[PDB]
Amino acid sequence: MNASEFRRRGKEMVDYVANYMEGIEGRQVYPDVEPGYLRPLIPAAAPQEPDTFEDIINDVEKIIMPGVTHWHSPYFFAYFPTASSYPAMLADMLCGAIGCIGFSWAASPACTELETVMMDWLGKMLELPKAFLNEKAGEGGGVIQGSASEATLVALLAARTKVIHRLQAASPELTQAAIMEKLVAYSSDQAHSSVERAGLIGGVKLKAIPSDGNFAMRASALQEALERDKAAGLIPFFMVATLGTTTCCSFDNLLEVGPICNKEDIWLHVDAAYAGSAFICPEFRHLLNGVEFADSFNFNPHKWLLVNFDCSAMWVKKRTDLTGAFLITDYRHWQIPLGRRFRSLKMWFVFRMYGVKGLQAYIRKHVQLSHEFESLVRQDPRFEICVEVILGLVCFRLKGSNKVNEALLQRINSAKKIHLVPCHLRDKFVLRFAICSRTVESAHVQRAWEHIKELAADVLRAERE
Amino acid sequence: MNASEFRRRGKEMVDYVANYMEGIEGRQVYPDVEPGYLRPLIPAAAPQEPDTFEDIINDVEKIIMPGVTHWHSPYFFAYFPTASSYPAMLADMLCGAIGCIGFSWAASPACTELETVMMDWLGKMLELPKAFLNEKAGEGGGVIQGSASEATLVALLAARTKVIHRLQAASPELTQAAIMEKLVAYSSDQAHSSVERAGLIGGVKLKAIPSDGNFAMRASALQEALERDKAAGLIPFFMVATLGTTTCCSFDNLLEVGPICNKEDIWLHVDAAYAGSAFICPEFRHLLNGVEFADSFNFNPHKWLLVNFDCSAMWVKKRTDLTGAFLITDYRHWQIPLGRRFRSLKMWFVFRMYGVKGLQAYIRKHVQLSHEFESLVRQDPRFEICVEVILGLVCFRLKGSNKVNEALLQRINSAKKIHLVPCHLRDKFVLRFAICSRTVESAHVQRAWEHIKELAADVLRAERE
Numbered sequence: 001m002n003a004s005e006f007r008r009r010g011k012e013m014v015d016y017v018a019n020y021m022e023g024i025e026g027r028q029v030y031p032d033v034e035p036g037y038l039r040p041l042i043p044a045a046a047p048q049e050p051d052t053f054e055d056i057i058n059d060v061e062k063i064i065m066p067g068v069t070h071w072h073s074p075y076f077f078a079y080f081p082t083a084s085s086y087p088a089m090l091a092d093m094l095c096g097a098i099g100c101i102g103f104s105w106a107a108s109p110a111c112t113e114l115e116t117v118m119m120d121w122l123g124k125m126l127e128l129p130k131a132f133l134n135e136k137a138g139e140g141g142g143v144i145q146g147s148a149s150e151a152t153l154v155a156l157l158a159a160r161t162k163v164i165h166r167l168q169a170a171s172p173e174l175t176q177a178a179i180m181e182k183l184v185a186y187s188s189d190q191a192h193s194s195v196e197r198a199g200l201i202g203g204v205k206l207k208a209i210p211s212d213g214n215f216a217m218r219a220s221a222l223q224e225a226l227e228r229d230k231a232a233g234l235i236p237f238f239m240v241a242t243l244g245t246t247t248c249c250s251f252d253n254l255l256e257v258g259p260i261c262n263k264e265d266i267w268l269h270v271d272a273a274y275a276g277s278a279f280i281c282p283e284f285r286h287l288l289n290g291v292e293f294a295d296s297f298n299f300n301p302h303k304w305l306l307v308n309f310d311c312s313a314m315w316v317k318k319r320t321d322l323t324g325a326f327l328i329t330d331y332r333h334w335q336i337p338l339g340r341r342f343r344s345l346k347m348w349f350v351f352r353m354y355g356v357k358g359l360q361a362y363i364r365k366h367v368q369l370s371h372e373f374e375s376l377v378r379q380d381p382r383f384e385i386c387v388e389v390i391l392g393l394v395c396f397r398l399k400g401s402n403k404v405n406e407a408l409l410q411r412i413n414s415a416k417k418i419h420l421v422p423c424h425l426r427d428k429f430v431l432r433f434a435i436c437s438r439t440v441e442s443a444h445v446q447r448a449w450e451h452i453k454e455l456a457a458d459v460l461r462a463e464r465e
Numbered sequence: 466m467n468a469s470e471f472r473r474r475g476k477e478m479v480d481y482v483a484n485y486m487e488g489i490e491g492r493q494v495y496p497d498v499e500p501g502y503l504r505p506l507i508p509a510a511a512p513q514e515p516d517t518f519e520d521i522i523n524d525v526e527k528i529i530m531p532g533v534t535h536w537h538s539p540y541f542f543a544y545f546p547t548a549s550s551y552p553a554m555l556a557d558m559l560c561g562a563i564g565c566i567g568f569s570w571a572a573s574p575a576c577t578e579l580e581t582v583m584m585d586w587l588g589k590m591l592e593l594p595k596a597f598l599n600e601k602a603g604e605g606g607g608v609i610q611g612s613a614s615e616a617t618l619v620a621l622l623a624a625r626t627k628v629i630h631r632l633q634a635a636s637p638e639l640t641q642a643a644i645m646e647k648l649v650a651y652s653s654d655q656a657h658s659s660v661e662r663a664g665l666i667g668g669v670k671l672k673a674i675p676s677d678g679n680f681a682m683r684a685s686a687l688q689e690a691l692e693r694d695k696a697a698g699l700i701p702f703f704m705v706a707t708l709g710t711t712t713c714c715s716f717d718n719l720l721e722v723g724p725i726c727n728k729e730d731i732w733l734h735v736d737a738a739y740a741g742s743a744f745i746c747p748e749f750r751h752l753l754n755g756v757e758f759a760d761s762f763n764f765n766p767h768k769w770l771l772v773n774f775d776c777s778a779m780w781v782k783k784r785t786d787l788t789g790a791f792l793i794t795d796y797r798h799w800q801i802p803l804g805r806r807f808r809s810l811k812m813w814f815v816f817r818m819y820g821v822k823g824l825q826a827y828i829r830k831h832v833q834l835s836h837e838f839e840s841l842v843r844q845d846p847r848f849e850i851c852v853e854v855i856l857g858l859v860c861f862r863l864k865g866s867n868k869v870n871e872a873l874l875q876r877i878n879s880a881k882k883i884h885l886v887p888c889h890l891r892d893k894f895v896l897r898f899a900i901c902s903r904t905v906e907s908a909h910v911q912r913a914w915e916h917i918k919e920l921a922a923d924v925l926r927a928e929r930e
């Protein structure tokens with residue numbers, strides 16, 4: 001394929017993408033296929049001679065789309081939003097066209113320099129402490145990571161290297177392994193599974209801090225764990241505090257946990273993968289208070305800031321600590337892989353084509369829609385809200401047994417009109433309602449609640465009986 | 466931005482991308498900017514109100530392009546090729562449009578099922594042993610990784626988990642840490658830096674095996690290292706054998722190293738990140754002989770098989786060993802991150818729009834151009850070829866001191882007409898000539914050699930004098 005043919009097919013793909021987005025409300029949000037549906041529908045071997053673009057696009061509609069879960073359907077209310085905007089799509093096309101692998105400054109200077117400036121743009125939009133920004137010769141700085149899960153692993157590896165060096169400085173005869181079986185990392189009992197995966201990769205123990213009634217990490221529970229583990233010979237070295245937990249969008253108390261981590265010499269990493277995008281709005285910035293005590297901070301523009309995956313933004317106070325784990329000219333020692341693509345183009349395009357006010361309006365509309373769903377639930381005494389509604393998530397359930405709530409969820413996902421997922425809060429089975437699609441409106445939320453209300457009546461009938 | 470506006474701007478971006486590719490030979494391949502050039506040229510903060518698409522695209526030409534190293538210029542001869550094809554670009558546009566995060570089967574069934582079938586397509590194109598393919602209920606299988614560096618880390622973590630479990634089964638009182646300071650991994654002295662990074666992340670020792678006269682790992686050097694380290698109390702557990710080393714495109718001997726790794730219970734990972742694409746051609750498949758002894762095999766379609774980054778293909782013999790490190794319905798335990806995008810669409814589009822024969826012709830043209838450059842060097846007795854030319858890489862130098870070769874390289878990269886990078890073979894400073902661009906032709910290679918020949922005369926003058 002040459003560029004002349006790409007001129008034709010590329011514009012045809014633009015129309016196909018726009019057609020799919022304009023009719024996405026006509027798609028069943030969750031598929032009806034079963035595992036293994038795809039292999040019988042395509043050949044067992046690659047074609048020796050080429051297929052036509054018409055044949056391929058037909059297969060996308062006939063064979064791929066039936067097995068697609070439409071994350072950007074307005075009726076997708078599962079997990080958390082993922083980003084989809086046309087400015088990011090346009091930058092992605094340019095990113096693949098330039099096609100550089102910026103493992104070094106020389107590999108493409110703009111690939112590294114634009115990223116550093118965009119991380120300062122974003123840091124200033126969130127009003128981060130100046131110690132996190134790279135501008136003005138500061139020792140801190142920011143990098144794009146592939147994911148928040150990778151960002152958490154990177155912070156743990158930097159913390160592990162730092163504590164090993166400190167411990168061996170105090171005791172030069174101490175081996176890295178003898179240190180290894182004493183290190184312990186901490187996170188909330190509401191922490192994302194990325195923390196457990198990072199502890200396993202890094203080869204250190206991980207313990208969960210019990211959350212309070214609001215599912216937040218507090219000073220008293222942390223001090224109680226430190227007292228026990230330090231007496232047992234464990235060495236606390238790393239902490240993941242979460243702002244906007246995956247379970248119920250709760251918030252660990254940084255003003256309490258921060259000073260404790262500092263005095264204990266515990267590397268404090270803040271996981272705000274979903275909630276972080278809201279901190280560009282002044283009415284939510286107070287939820288970030290205490291980040292000045294953190295050693296690293298991370299959130300996902302590819303969740304709630306319209307920058308298509310992959311784009312996770314991570315800042316650190318000391319870049320030298322980051323480079324220990326394997327003005328800013330190179331990002332090799334900031335990430336797990338060595339290669340990387342021109343991902344900052346997506347941030348640049350999104351920030352410029354929306355503006356700060358356009359992004360703020362997008363956040364506030366989603367939070368407003370969240371409170372609209374919460375208001376509907378609060379009008380039905382058969383239901384209860386389990387956690388305070390702050391951002392684009394509502395955790396609710398039928399009053400009574402978990403069995404009746406497991407049955408309501410099964411009916412919802414069986415009808416395949418809307419899609420949501422549950423969680424477990426202590427021993428309580430809880431349903432989640434997450435505002436996800438960029439194009440979701442009040443009408444979609446209202447229809448979703450009517451569907452939930454109807455199915456709950458059928459479920460409540462079947463259990464009394 | 467709505468879909469109607471994307472219809473206009475998306476087609477405008479298609480024309481901009483096609484224009485850039487059609488005029489890429491008019492671009493200076495390596496930039497003249499210095500580190501820090503970008504920040505003074507764009508504002509210090511994001512715009513509050515949106516900018517226009519016209520303003521942004523103008524900034525791409527005025528401000529971004531001067532700091533771009535054009536990897537797809539025909540005169541880019543550095544490192545190794547990276548993939549850029551229009552079928553992959555078209556699939557990338559669709560990938561971002563579907564916009565699913567396939568961390569689970571339910572997150573989008575097609576995102577996982579197409580990947581498994583495409584890895585069987587690719588495995589059959591390389592004529593891998595059936596134990597690596599997923600088709601027909603085999604215990605093996607393949608996954609797309611973000612990079613070969615990440616693929617090497619994943620194999621090391623699986624090997625580490627497996628040997629820890631085996632050692633603790635034989636000695637139940639043995640701690641994971643006591644095992645940790647005895648584990649040792651191996652690689653060639655020509656190994657990519659990804660291996661050293663994986664050893665540091667995994668927390669294990671890494672030793673280099675001395676290469677032979679052809680810079681290949683051999684049985685005798687491996688047996689000598691095993692004899693020394695086993696006597697010292699180290700426990701060999703992981704080996705990275707390289708097919709197509711980054712330094713000189715040498716090949717470790719799998720027929721010798723494979724059986725040794727098997728009998729020593731050493732997990733054998735084969736790193737063929739660049740060379741692997743050539744193994745779809747029958748005349749090169751013999752270079753892969755011995756992969757039947759490997760526990761995991763990896764190569765990069767995003768290097769030499771026209772599938773735009775990111776796309777690294779990894780196969781394993783036992784998926785259960787892979788899932789230990791944190792029919793095929795989930796890929797969470799095959800990779801470092803949890804989230805992932807619909808990357809298999811790029812493989813599907815490239816394989817179908819080119820066909821196996823189209824990809825074979827692309828490989829053979831590059832190798833033919835490599836031998837054309839080698840032939841020119843072999844006509845000049847002032848130069849020498851240091852390693853046998855097999856694929857798209859030629860390692861050459863002026864006969865004499867390293868200083869005269871360091872000077873020739875500095876003149877080449879200072880003239881900014883072509884771009885290449887050097888290596889070190891033992892104590893010898895060596896220049897690399899890599900066939901990279903998809904659109905490179907004989908005329909480009911011939912002009913590059915004339916440039917090198919001219920600058921070598923100037924350099925040889927300045928040193929005798």
Ligand SMILES: *Cc1c(COP(=O)(O)O)cnc(C)c1O
Binds near residue numbers: 080192246312
């Ligand atoms: C989504 C989420 C993650 C996962 O991040 P990815 O970028 O998908 O790896 C981690 N932590 C929290 C709190 C999240 O919401």
Ligand SMILES: *Cc1c(COP(=O)(O)O)cnc(C)c1O
Binds near residue numbers: 614709777
């Ligand atoms: C390029 C290369 C790598 C690097 O792989 P990435 O996908 O860039 O991480 C590793 N090993 C070899 C042999 C390579 O050629």
